Amino acid sequence: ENLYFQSDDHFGLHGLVFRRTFAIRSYEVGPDRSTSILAVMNHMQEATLNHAKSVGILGDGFGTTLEMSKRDLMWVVRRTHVAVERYPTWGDTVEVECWIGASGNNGMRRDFLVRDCKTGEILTRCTSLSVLMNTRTRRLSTIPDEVRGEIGPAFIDNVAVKDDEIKKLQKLNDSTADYIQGGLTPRWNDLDVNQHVNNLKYVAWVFETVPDSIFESHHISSFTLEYRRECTRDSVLRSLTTVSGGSSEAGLVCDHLLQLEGGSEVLRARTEWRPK
Amino acid sequence: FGLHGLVFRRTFAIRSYEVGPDRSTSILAVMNHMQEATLNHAKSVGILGDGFGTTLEMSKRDLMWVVRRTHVAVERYPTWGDTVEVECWIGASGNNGMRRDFLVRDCKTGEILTRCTSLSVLMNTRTRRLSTIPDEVRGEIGPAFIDNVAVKDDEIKKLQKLNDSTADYIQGGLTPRWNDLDVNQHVNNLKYVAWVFETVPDSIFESHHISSFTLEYRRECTRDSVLRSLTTVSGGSSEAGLVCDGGSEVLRARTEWRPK
């Protein structure tokens, strides 16, 4: 019912939703033949960058528009929520539907829908919240009008994930964590365009302390991350995970924490699991 | 993607996470592409079998393919936004070996970016003994054989093990996780490559691109394996790879580098 959601040839309008097909590759699936959530998030990240190009948003970046680039501003992801119904397998063809939208006066949200091309079933729903940061002062910035003039006309109001589904996360008690791993350090290729560690590197470090027994038995159905701080090449991190068993009423839950070791919080995260 | 007639072809659009901070595609992304082209080829010539290359006649005789040598030649790494095309095919290699060869081209210029060949042999999973190729299995893969090579014998040198007591860089405690494992409890070959590069200092990745990569595999590892990676740098600019389990050799490898 939103005209600008449809493709260009539907209404003769410049559409604001990017679409792209992915065929699941061999190295993207685990021993259980399921695509990993890291491959799914890779897909959405790739669709992100393509989307900016498709709506007439400027030169990269990974981001980063001119008005932003003039003001030494960059996007930083501060929240991510992923809802997974079913993971595709090798050879399956999926389609990512992605777009951007406002989040208050100074936030921007990117939302994603991934469908199974054969069944038309929705496999993945996601939304990520980004904010502006000054690269020099490492300080959060409001969105200047020159930047709103760039990304604003690309906004649509649709959501893939309702607020109801996203719960504010509690930091786990790091002194009673079920699993802990320190000495985590980024290497040369793990860094981004501006001195900072890749966003999906963080996700990898989160899974460092998830026991293999949970990966063998369960699939991630929900994934929520709250980022609070960037990391550099000389960062050394500690990953922590706390398991909230599922053996009655309650399903399997994992709480997560990346900290600078020690012990300023880098992020907190929460995974919900379902039996395979 | 498409087969024509016994040479499979497939396009990859370079993805962002496949590209490094220098905007160059990593050698592992290239090897990721070929793993993918491998299985596509296999399916299209009808040798995929159980989903990974073990045919009906192979499994009955408890046989599976094992990679024993890989050589990758890279002229230029593609960058983000580039679209590449992979050519893959198989052929006989001696009396009991099978070779898989690869050509990767830039779709715009048509220049060859990467040439590669891998040698596989049959191994009994029960007796741990290399096996000859039974006629029943040759009957399966044989009609798919072609004689072309992407990499000449000339270009591949036998590797010497580095002195593990004189290694410039060493890292132990390397252990595989559940996701690092394949269908039959064994660690994935691209996990090995990751472990190889573990002891290559960031300074070399910053200064140089890999122009050549040669791997000789000796042994498989299991879920309870604990490994040590070793690298010795002898410019300019070569390094000799070694992967140790005790200290029994798992594989040896060799990279040649050129300034970016």
UniProtKB/Swiss-Prot annotation, chain B:
Site positions (Important for catalytic activity): 182, 184, 186, 220
Catalytic activity: dodecanoyl-[ACP] + H2O = dodecanoate + holo-[ACP] + H(+)
Consequence of changing residue 64 to W: Reduces catalytic activity 75-fold
GO molecular function, one term: acyl carrier activity
Listed EC numbers: 3.1.2.21
Catalytic class of the enzyme: hydrolase
Tissue: Expressed in developing cotyledons. Not detected in leaves.
Outcome recorded upon mutating residue 36 to Q: Loss of catalytic activity
Assigned keywords, A-Z: Chloroplast, Fatty acid biosynthesis, Fatty acid metabolism, Genetically modified food, Hydrolase, Lipid biosynthesis, Lipid metabolism, Plastid, Transit peptide
Consequence recorded when altering residue 186 to A: Loss of catalytic activity
Outcome recorded upon mutating residue 177 to E: Loss of catalytic activity
Compartment list: Plastid, Chloroplast
Protein name per its UniProtKB record: Dodecanoyl-[acyl-carrier-protein] hydrolase, chloroplastic
Lineage: Eukaryota, Viridiplantae, Streptophyta, Embryophyta, Tracheophyta
Gene: FATB1
Residues of the whole record sequence present: 100 to 365 of 382
